[PDB]
Protein backbone atom coordinates (compact mmCIF):
# COMPACT_ATOMS: atom_id res chain seq x y z
CA UNK A 1 0.00 0.00 0.00
CA UNK A 2 1.08 3.65 0.42
CA UNK A 3 2.70 3.23 3.88
CA UNK A 4 4.89 1.03 6.07
CA UNK A 5 4.48 1.53 9.80
CA UNK A 6 3.15 4.79 11.18
CA UNK A 7 5.33 7.08 9.16
CA UNK A 8 7.18 5.64 6.14
CA UNK A 9 5.82 6.53 2.71
CA UNK A 10 6.59 3.72 0.21
CA UNK A 11 8.10 5.08 -2.99
CA UNK A 12 9.56 3.73 -6.18
CA UNK A 13 11.39 0.49 -6.90
CA UNK A 14 15.11 1.27 -6.70
CA UNK A 15 18.34 -0.68 -7.50
CA UNK A 16 19.00 -3.57 -9.93
CA UNK A 17 17.73 -7.14 -9.53
CA UNK A 18 15.22 -7.14 -6.65
CA UNK A 19 12.08 -7.44 -8.85
CA UNK A 20 10.28 -4.99 -6.52
CA UNK A 21 12.01 -6.19 -3.35
CA UNK A 22 13.64 -2.75 -2.79
CA UNK A 23 11.88 0.60 -2.66
CA UNK A 24 12.78 4.13 -1.85
CA UNK A 25 10.94 5.21 1.28
CA UNK A 26 10.51 8.44 3.16
CA UNK A 27 10.14 8.99 6.84
CA UNK A 28 7.38 11.62 6.71
CA UNK A 29 7.87 12.39 10.38
CA UNK A 30 11.57 13.18 9.93
CA UNK A 31 11.76 14.22 6.26
CA UNK A 32 14.37 11.48 5.66
CA UNK A 33 14.73 9.01 2.83
CA UNK A 34 15.01 5.34 3.82
CA UNK A 35 15.40 1.90 2.18
CA UNK A 36 12.33 -0.35 2.23
CA UNK A 37 13.01 -4.02 1.77
CA UNK A 38 9.87 -5.94 0.87
CA UNK A 39 9.24 -9.66 1.07
CA UNK A 40 5.95 -11.17 -0.02
CA UNK A 41 4.14 -12.68 3.01
CA UNK A 42 3.49 -15.67 0.70
CA UNK A 43 7.29 -16.30 0.41
CA UNK A 44 8.18 -20.00 0.37
CA UNK A 45 11.61 -19.03 1.80
CA UNK A 46 11.14 -16.11 4.24
CA UNK A 47 14.37 -14.38 5.22
CA UNK A 48 13.36 -10.81 6.09
CA UNK A 49 12.20 -11.41 9.68
CA UNK A 50 15.30 -13.51 10.47
CA UNK A 51 17.40 -10.72 8.91
CA UNK A 52 15.67 -8.16 11.12
CA UNK A 53 16.42 -10.34 14.14
CA UNK A 54 20.08 -10.52 13.15
CA UNK A 55 20.10 -6.71 12.94
CA UNK A 56 18.65 -6.42 16.45
CA UNK A 57 21.37 -8.76 17.69
CA UNK A 58 24.04 -6.68 15.89
CA UNK A 59 22.72 -3.53 17.46
CA UNK A 60 23.99 -0.09 16.61
CA UNK A 61 27.38 -0.34 14.97
CA UNK A 62 29.89 1.36 12.70
CA UNK A 63 29.05 0.52 9.07
CA UNK A 64 25.87 -1.31 10.07
CA UNK A 65 22.78 0.34 8.59
CA UNK A 66 20.24 1.56 11.08
CA UNK A 67 17.00 -0.40 11.01
CA UNK A 68 13.93 1.66 11.72
CA UNK A 69 11.07 -0.73 11.37
CA UNK A 70 9.90 -4.19 10.61
CA UNK A 71 6.27 -4.86 9.87
CA UNK A 72 3.57 -5.59 7.39
CA UNK A 73 2.96 -3.54 4.29
CA UNK A 74 0.00 -4.90 2.34
CA UNK A 75 0.81 -8.49 1.33
CA UNK A 76 4.50 -7.91 2.17
CA UNK A 77 6.62 -7.84 5.21
CA UNK A 78 8.75 -4.74 5.09
CA UNK A 79 11.97 -3.73 6.70
CA UNK A 80 12.74 -0.07 6.73
CA UNK A 81 16.44 0.63 7.07
CA UNK A 82 18.95 3.37 6.47
CA UNK A 83 19.31 4.43 2.84
CA UNK A 84 22.93 3.85 1.87
CA UNK A 85 24.91 4.70 -1.25
CA UNK A 86 26.16 2.44 -4.04
CA UNK A 87 27.61 -0.98 -3.46
CA UNK A 88 31.27 -1.83 -3.99
CA UNK A 89 30.15 -3.78 -7.06
CA UNK A 90 28.42 -0.63 -8.51
CA UNK A 91 31.52 1.32 -7.65
CA UNK A 92 33.85 -1.37 -9.06
CA UNK A 93 32.00 -1.07 -12.42
CA UNK A 94 32.22 2.72 -12.22
CA UNK A 95 36.01 2.29 -11.82
CA UNK A 96 36.30 -0.08 -14.83
CA UNK A 97 36.47 -3.17 -12.57
CA UNK A 98 39.81 -2.64 -10.93
CA UNK A 99 40.47 -0.92 -7.64
CA UNK A 100 43.85 0.45 -6.65
CA UNK A 101 45.64 -1.18 -3.79
CA UNK A 102 45.11 1.95 -1.71
CA UNK A 103 41.35 1.72 -2.28
CA UNK A 104 41.31 -2.01 -1.62
CA UNK A 105 43.32 -1.52 1.61
CA UNK A 106 41.02 1.26 2.88
CA UNK A 107 38.09 -1.11 2.17
CA UNK A 108 39.88 -4.13 3.66
CA UNK A 109 40.91 -2.36 6.88
CA UNK A 110 37.28 -1.36 7.44
CA UNK A 111 35.81 -4.71 6.50
CA UNK A 112 38.14 -6.73 8.80
CA UNK A 113 36.78 -4.49 11.52
CA UNK A 114 33.25 -4.78 10.11
CA UNK A 115 33.57 -8.58 10.25
CA UNK A 116 35.10 -8.54 13.74
CA UNK A 117 32.12 -6.46 14.92
CA UNK A 118 29.62 -9.00 13.45
CA UNK A 119 31.64 -11.80 15.05
CA UNK A 120 31.69 -9.92 18.38
CA UNK A 121 27.87 -10.13 18.30
CA UNK A 122 28.12 -13.93 17.95
CA UNK A 123 27.20 -13.85 14.30
CA UNK A 124 28.91 -15.16 11.24
CA UNK A 125 27.93 -13.35 8.07
CA UNK A 126 28.28 -15.97 5.30
CA UNK A 127 27.36 -13.67 2.38
CA UNK A 128 30.53 -11.80 1.47
CA UNK A 129 30.26 -10.19 -1.94
CA UNK A 130 30.86 -6.64 -3.25
CA UNK A 131 27.07 -6.08 -3.63
CA UNK A 132 26.59 -6.34 0.16
CA UNK A 133 29.08 -3.58 1.01
CA UNK A 134 27.73 -0.09 0.49
CA UNK A 135 29.07 3.37 0.98
CA UNK A 136 26.81 5.77 2.81
CA UNK A 137 25.17 8.82 1.35
CA UNK A 138 26.80 12.31 1.58
CA UNK A 139 23.80 13.53 3.64
CA UNK A 140 24.55 11.16 6.54
CA UNK A 141 28.27 12.12 6.87
CA UNK A 142 29.01 8.38 6.37
CA UNK A 143 29.57 8.36 2.60
CA UNK A 144 33.19 7.39 3.26
CA UNK A 145 32.19 4.44 5.50
CA UNK A 146 31.92 0.98 3.97
CA UNK A 147 28.75 -0.55 5.38
CA UNK A 148 27.69 -4.14 5.45
CA UNK A 149 24.19 -5.11 4.49
CA UNK A 150 22.22 -8.26 3.86
CA UNK A 151 22.23 -10.46 6.96
CA UNK A 152 19.64 -13.00 5.65
CA UNK A 153 22.34 -15.67 5.41
CA UNK A 154 23.90 -14.96 8.82
CA UNK A 155 24.14 -17.49 11.63
CA UNK A 156 24.72 -17.40 15.34
CA UNK A 157 27.97 -19.33 15.76
CA UNK A 158 27.86 -19.10 19.56
CA UNK A 159 24.88 -21.02 20.98
CA UNK A 160 23.16 -18.52 23.28
CA UNK A 161 22.22 -21.02 26.01
CA UNK A 162 25.34 -23.24 25.94
CA UNK A 163 27.69 -20.28 25.16
CA UNK A 164 29.66 -22.78 23.07
CA UNK A 165 30.83 -22.28 19.52
CA UNK A 166 28.57 -24.18 17.10
CA UNK A 167 29.73 -27.72 16.41
CA UNK A 168 31.79 -28.61 13.41
CA UNK A 169 29.85 -30.47 10.78
CA UNK A 170 29.66 -31.04 7.04
CA UNK A 171 27.13 -31.79 4.27
CA UNK A 172 25.91 -28.23 4.47
CA UNK A 173 24.08 -27.57 1.18
CA UNK A 174 25.67 -24.88 -0.98
CA UNK A 175 23.64 -21.73 -1.60
CA UNK A 176 25.85 -18.65 -1.12
CA UNK A 177 27.91 -16.79 -3.74
CA UNK A 178 30.35 -19.23 -5.33
CA UNK A 179 32.86 -16.56 -6.42
CA UNK A 180 34.01 -15.47 -2.94
CA UNK A 181 33.17 -18.39 -0.72
CA UNK A 182 35.91 -20.13 1.19
CA UNK A 183 37.40 -23.42 0.03
CA UNK A 184 35.88 -24.99 3.17
CA UNK A 185 32.39 -23.72 2.25
CA UNK A 186 32.84 -25.51 -1.13
CA UNK A 187 33.56 -28.72 0.82
CA UNK A 188 30.17 -28.42 2.57
CA UNK A 189 31.72 -27.61 5.95
CA UNK A 190 29.89 -25.55 8.54
CA UNK A 191 31.04 -21.96 8.07
CA UNK A 192 32.73 -20.18 10.92
CA UNK A 193 34.54 -16.86 11.46
CA UNK A 194 37.47 -17.94 9.30
CA UNK A 195 35.16 -18.31 6.29
CA UNK A 196 33.89 -14.71 6.38
CA UNK A 197 37.52 -13.54 6.44
CA UNK A 198 38.61 -15.87 3.65
CA UNK A 199 35.64 -14.72 1.48
CA UNK A 200 36.87 -11.15 2.19
CA UNK A 201 40.33 -12.14 0.97
CA UNK A 202 38.85 -13.47 -2.28
CA UNK A 203 36.87 -10.29 -2.77
CA UNK A 204 39.97 -8.19 -2.09
CA UNK A 205 41.83 -10.16 -4.78
CA UNK A 206 38.88 -9.79 -7.12
CA UNK A 207 39.08 -6.00 -6.68
CA UNK A 208 42.89 -5.95 -7.17
CA UNK A 209 43.01 -8.29 -10.18
CA UNK A 210 39.73 -7.21 -11.68
CA UNK A 211 38.59 -10.85 -11.68
CA UNK A 212 39.18 -14.21 -10.00
CA UNK A 213 40.47 -17.19 -12.01
CA UNK A 214 37.41 -19.35 -11.25
CA UNK A 215 34.97 -16.63 -12.21
CA UNK A 216 34.10 -17.94 -15.73
CA UNK A 217 33.28 -21.52 -14.68
CA UNK A 218 29.92 -22.92 -15.76
CA UNK A 219 28.24 -26.28 -15.24
CA UNK A 220 24.94 -28.06 -16.00
CA UNK A 221 24.08 -28.04 -12.27
CA UNK A 222 24.75 -25.54 -9.47
CA UNK A 223 26.44 -28.29 -7.47
CA UNK A 224 28.85 -29.03 -10.36
CA UNK A 225 29.57 -25.35 -10.85
CA UNK A 226 30.32 -24.97 -7.08
CA UNK A 227 32.47 -28.11 -7.37
CA UNK A 228 34.50 -26.76 -10.34
CA UNK A 229 34.93 -23.37 -8.68
CA UNK A 230 36.10 -24.96 -5.44
CA UNK A 231 38.42 -27.24 -7.42
CA UNK A 232 39.94 -24.18 -9.14
CA UNK A 233 40.30 -22.35 -5.82
CA UNK A 234 42.09 -25.40 -4.42
CA UNK A 235 44.22 -25.71 -7.67
CA UNK A 236 45.26 -22.02 -7.67
CA UNK A 237 48.26 -21.44 -5.42
CA UNK A 238 47.86 -18.42 -3.11
CA UNK A 239 51.24 -17.27 -4.44
CA UNK A 240 49.84 -17.19 -7.93
CA UNK A 241 46.39 -15.70 -7.11
CA UNK A 242 48.11 -13.03 -4.95
CA UNK A 243 51.04 -12.39 -7.26
CA UNK A 244 52.27 -8.83 -6.63
CA UNK A 245 50.35 -8.65 -3.37
CA UNK A 246 52.39 -10.48 -0.71
CA UNK A 247 50.28 -9.19 2.20
CA UNK A 248 47.18 -10.53 0.46
CA UNK A 249 48.92 -13.89 0.10
CA UNK A 250 49.83 -13.69 3.83
CA UNK A 251 46.23 -12.73 4.75
CA UNK A 252 44.77 -15.50 2.57
CA UNK A 253 46.99 -18.32 3.82
CA UNK A 254 46.49 -17.20 7.43
CA UNK A 255 42.66 -17.25 7.15
CA UNK A 256 42.77 -20.49 5.07
CA UNK A 257 44.80 -22.11 7.88
CA UNK A 258 42.43 -21.03 10.67
CA UNK A 259 40.86 -23.83 12.63
CA UNK A 260 37.03 -24.09 12.53
CA UNK A 261 36.60 -22.92 16.16
CA UNK A 262 39.48 -20.40 16.16
CA UNK A 263 39.14 -16.67 16.91
CA UNK A 264 40.84 -14.85 14.06
CA UNK A 265 43.55 -12.42 15.02
CA UNK A 266 41.79 -9.45 13.48
CA UNK A 267 44.50 -7.18 14.93
CA UNK A 268 47.16 -9.12 13.05
CA UNK A 269 45.19 -8.98 9.77
CA UNK A 270 44.52 -5.26 10.07
CA UNK A 271 48.18 -4.66 10.82
CA UNK A 272 49.31 -6.59 7.71
CA UNK A 273 47.22 -4.10 5.73
CA UNK A 274 47.92 -0.92 7.71
CA UNK A 275 51.69 -1.75 7.71
CA UNK A 276 51.54 -2.20 3.91
CA UNK A 277 49.43 0.92 3.55
CA UNK A 278 51.95 3.02 5.52
CA UNK A 279 54.83 1.41 3.69
CA UNK A 280 53.37 2.52 0.29
CA UNK A 281 52.99 6.07 1.62
CA UNK A 282 49.22 5.92 1.30
CA UNK A 283 47.22 8.26 3.47
CA UNK A 284 43.95 6.99 4.89
CA UNK A 285 41.97 9.92 3.56
CA UNK A 286 38.98 8.03 2.12
CA UNK A 287 40.00 9.16 -1.35
CA UNK A 288 38.76 6.02 -2.99
CA UNK A 289 39.12 5.39 -6.70
CA UNK A 290 35.46 6.36 -7.17
CA UNK A 291 35.86 9.81 -5.63
CA UNK A 292 35.30 12.51 -8.28
CA UNK A 293 33.23 10.10 -10.41
CA UNK A 294 29.46 10.22 -10.96
CA UNK A 295 28.09 7.83 -8.38
CA UNK A 296 24.73 6.09 -8.74
CA UNK A 297 21.90 7.29 -6.45
CA UNK A 298 20.03 6.71 -4.09
N1 LIG B 1 20.26 0.17 2.60
C1 LIG B 1 20.27 0.22 1.30
N2 LIG B 1 20.51 1.39 0.70
C2 LIG B 1 20.50 1.27 -0.63
N3 LIG B 1 20.72 2.33 -1.38
C3 LIG B 1 20.71 2.33 -2.68
C4 LIG B 1 19.72 1.67 -3.41
C5 LIG B 1 19.76 1.71 -4.79
C6 LIG B 1 20.78 2.43 -5.41
C7 LIG B 1 21.75 3.11 -4.69
CL1 LIG B 1 23.01 4.00 -5.49
C8 LIG B 1 21.71 3.05 -3.31
S1 LIG B 1 20.13 -0.37 -1.18
C9 LIG B 1 20.05 -0.88 0.42
C10 LIG B 1 19.67 -2.30 0.85
O1 LIG B 1 19.51 -2.60 2.03
C11 LIG B 1 19.38 -3.32 -0.23
C12 LIG B 1 20.30 -3.54 -1.27
C13 LIG B 1 20.02 -4.47 -2.26
C14 LIG B 1 18.83 -5.20 -2.18
F1 LIG B 1 18.57 -6.11 -3.14
C15 LIG B 1 17.92 -5.00 -1.14
C16 LIG B 1 18.18 -4.05 -0.17
CL1 LIG C 1 36.18 0.73 10.41
CL1 LIG D 1 47.65 8.41 -0.71
MG1 LIG E 1 24.67 4.46 11.98
MG1 LIG F 1 21.96 -11.13 -1.09
UniProtKB/Swiss-Prot annotation:
The chain holds residues 36 to 333 of 447 of the full protein. Belongs to the protein kinase superfamily. CK1 Ser/Thr protein kinase family. Casein kinase I subfamily. The lineage of its organism: Eukaryota, Metazoa, Chordata, Craniata, Vertebrata. It catalyses: L-seryl-[protein] + ATP = O-phospho-L-seryl-[protein] + ADP + H(+); L-threonyl-[protein] + ATP = O-phospho-L-threonyl-[protein] + ADP + H(+). Monomer. GO terms for molecular function: ATP binding; protein kinase activity; protein serine kinase activity; protein serine/threonine kinase activity. Its EC number is 2.7.11.1. Inhibited by triazolodiamine 1 (5-amino-3-([4-(aminosulfonyl)phenyl]amino)-N-(2,6-difluorophenyl)-1H-1,2,4-triazole-1-carbothioamide), (S)-propane-1,2-diol, 2-({6-[(3-chlorophenyl)amino]-9-isopropyl-9H-purin-2-yl}amino)-3-methylbutan-1-ol, N2-[(1R,2S)-2-aminocyclohexyl]-N6-(3-chlorophenyl)-9-ethyl-9H-purine-2,6-diamine and [4-amino-2-(3-chloroanilino)-1,3-thiazol-5-yl](4-fluorophenyl)methanone. Serine/threonine-protein kinase. Casein kinases are operationally defined by their preferential utilization of acidic proteins such as caseins as substrates. It can phosphorylate a large number of proteins. Participates in Wnt signaling. Regulates fast synaptic transmission mediated by glutamate. This is Casein kinase I isoform gamma-3. It is found in: Cytoplasm. One of its GO terms (biological process) is Wnt signaling pathway. Residues 8-278 form the Protein kinase domain. Keywords: Acetylation, ATP-binding, Cytoplasm, Kinase, Nucleotide-binding, Phosphoprotein, Serine/threonine-protein kinase, Transferase, Wnt signaling pathway. The active site is at 127 (proton acceptor). Autophosphorylated. GO terms for cellular component: cytoplasm; nucleus; plasma membrane. ATP binds at residues 14-22, 37. Disulfide bonds: none annotated. It comes from the Eukaryota.
